[PDB]
């Protein structure tokens, strides 16, 4: 339709913006414990999924939680300890964050060039309705 | 017109030497690494009228088989081999491949094996005795010592079988082992002969050679190079938008 | 059959040595750095690719 | 790009390397302890163009390419060696020679 | 023929190869 | 990557040195012993080809 | 259903809790 372009970009945009709203928060909970009900915090991710509408979108279907194992943490003066006296403690890659962050910041810059160049061509284009 | 896929091309090709280049700087610790060299290749587009454009393309040579420095950690099964020896191991698909990676285990079954890999010597693999420990000749010779027998009875069991390929004509397959390549295999058979010639060293590993300089020095020309190209990149961008105002009346 | 044999009062310590653990420290220290520079060029070539 | 996804293995492989060197480094003292020691490996690598033809009555390089995937850290292994005897007069403490391990 | 002229015979398609055999 | 294997190697080396001079002064008194000495050599030299 | 379509009511104001209820 042409016109189909704005909402793909759109549509990478958010999913971009998701990705890096979760790894800013992430970052945030990296050396937190015990959050609500006493739950041991753990570490999400986003995944990326296109719009068959051939060619589409991109979406973020769910947050999925990290299978990768908890750290254990003796300290049996917190009442979080269990019988061995272990801490469960958030698995949180630094390096992997800060990689998703840049990722996150190039696509999004991408997809803006990208969105700027064809509204240009758009622009261009109703010169010849007269 | 063109020009700006010239460049383009040129980008691409820097983006993916600079990827070879972060690969080599990466596993700069694995024990017995080889490096992968690099250098950019040129190929011309011509014919009937003004060859002028001359694409790049990258392109990686074998590798370089300077040895790698050696650190002595005294456990009784690891090798060092001389400027190009090589250990041959069977692969997965099981043919044969070399390495100099001389983290050599032994399994519980007396099963001797490079990680993933077992060791090849006069036949097939080699296999030592359930338990005893293995000491390793200056030339190959596994000596077994059964535990609690006296020592007077130790005991040869086997022998390392030992290549040597002076580096220009071996290339890494898809798995880090190397083979020979075709008109190289044609020539020495499809299976190298051992040699004596070749001495190892025990109780000392070898690392990879990967040097820092020339990875530094590489980082800053792709980086200029890829920031050149876009720069010409934008300028023929800008220069073909200006100019496509003729048709206009 | 290879069992060892027994002393009173004495306790094996750990096999540990210090200097190989040192250097490698200043090792893994170093190859970080390079690799962190790494990514640093990379993200500056992506970021000038994106300011085209 | 496969530059970021490739360091960030290099990265995640050193800092595991300095997890183990700081772990065998903390139990200096603990009594009969072995030291670890971990090995990497480098992934399966891509290859892009085939080798063309050589020895041509020519001395070119070889032409073909083929990028790498970064290290994964394969395996830790403990030096089962033997330690030094402290003496602790204590008449109930036991100091194995050799290998053997209490059940 | 000069560049950019008239001519009656297709030019011959271009080959650009990595490494001559 | 260079000085710093070859500098270990070094250390490890005066390490062992040092453990038997240890070994030897400390049965300075039993009965029967016979002292030790080490002995070192280098490790292998790589080559570079001239053109 | 999917963020960005159109509803006919308004979402469900949002809170953080510090400490469950």
């Not at chain 1, 299978?67 to 979080?80: I, S």
């Not at chain 1, 992997?96 to 064809?118: D, F």
């Not at chain 2, 580096?167 to 051992?194: H, I, K, M, Y």
């Amino acid at each position: 339709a042409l016109l189909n372009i704005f909402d793909i970009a759109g549509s990478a945009l958010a999913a971009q913006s998701k990705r890096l709203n979760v790894a800013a928060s992430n970052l945030a909970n990296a050396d937190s414990v015990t959050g609500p009900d006493g739950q041991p915090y753990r570490a999400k991710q986003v995944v990326f999924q296109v719009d068959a509408a051939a060619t589409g979108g991109v979406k973020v279907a769910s947050v999925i939680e990290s299978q990768a194992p908890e750290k254990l943490v003796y300290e049996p003066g917190n009442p979080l300890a269990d019988a061995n006296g272990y801490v469960k403690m958030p698995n949180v890659d630094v390096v992997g964050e800060m990689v998703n962050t840049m990722s996150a910041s190039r696509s999004y810059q991408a997809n803006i060039e990208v969105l700027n160049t064809v509204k240009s061509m758009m622009l261009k284009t109703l010169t010849l309705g007269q | 017109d063109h020009a700006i896929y010239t460049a383009m091309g040129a980008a691409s090709q820097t983006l993916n030497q600079q990827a070879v280049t972060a690969s080599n700087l990466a596993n700069a610790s694995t024990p017995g690494f080889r490096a992968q060299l690099n250098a950019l290749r040129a190929v011309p587009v011509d014919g009937l009228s003004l060859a002028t454009r001359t694409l790049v393309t990258a392109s990686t040579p074998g590798a370089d088989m300077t040895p790698g420095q050696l650190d002595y950690t005294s456990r009784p099964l690891d090798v060092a081999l001389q400027q190009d020896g090589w250990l041959v191991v069977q692969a997965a698909d099981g043919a044969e491949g070399y390495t100099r990676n001389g983290n050599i285990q032994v399994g519980p079954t007396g099963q001797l094996t490079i990680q993933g890999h077992p060791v090849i010597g006069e036949g097939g693999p080699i296999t030592v005795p359930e338990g005893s420990e293995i000491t390793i000749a200056a030339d190959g010779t596994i000596s077994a010592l059964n535990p609690g027998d006296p020592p007077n009875t130790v005991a040869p069991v086997g022998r390392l079988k030992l290549v040597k390929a002076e580096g220009n004509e071996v290339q890494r397959s898809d798995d880090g082992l190397f083979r020979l390549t075709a008109e190289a295999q044609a020539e020495r058979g499809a299976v190298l002969a051992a040699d004596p010639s070749i001495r190892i060293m025990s109780g000392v590993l070898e690392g990879s050679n990967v040097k820092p300089v020339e990875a530094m020095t590489d980082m800053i020309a792709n980086a200029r190079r890829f920031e050149m190209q876009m720069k010409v990149i934008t300028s023929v961008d800008e220069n073909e938008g200006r100019a496509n105002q003729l048709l206009s009346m | 059959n290879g069992a060892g044999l027994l002393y009173q009062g004495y306790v094996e310590t750990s096999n540990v040595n210090v200097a190989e653990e040192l250097v490698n420290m200043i090792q893994v220290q170093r190859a970080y750095e390079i690799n962190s520079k790494a990514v640093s060029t990379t993200d500056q070539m992506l970021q000038k690719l994106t300011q085209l | 790009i496969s530059s970021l996804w490739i360091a960030k293995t290099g990265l995640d492989a050193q800092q595991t390397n300095m997890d183990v060197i700081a772990n065998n480094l903390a139990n200096v003292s603990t009594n009969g302890f072995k030291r670890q020691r971990a090995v990497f490996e480098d992934l399966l690598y891509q290859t892009i163009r085939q080798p063309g033809a050589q020895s041509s009555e020519q001395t070119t390089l070889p032409s073909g390419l083929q990028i790498g995937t970064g290290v994964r850290p394969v395996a830790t292994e403990r030096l089962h060696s033997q330690g030094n005897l402290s003496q602790t007069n204590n008449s109930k403490d036991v100091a194995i020679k050799g290998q053997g391990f209490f059940q | 023929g000069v560049p950019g002229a008239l001519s009656n015979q297709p030019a011959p398609p271009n080959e650009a190869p990595i490494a001559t055999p």
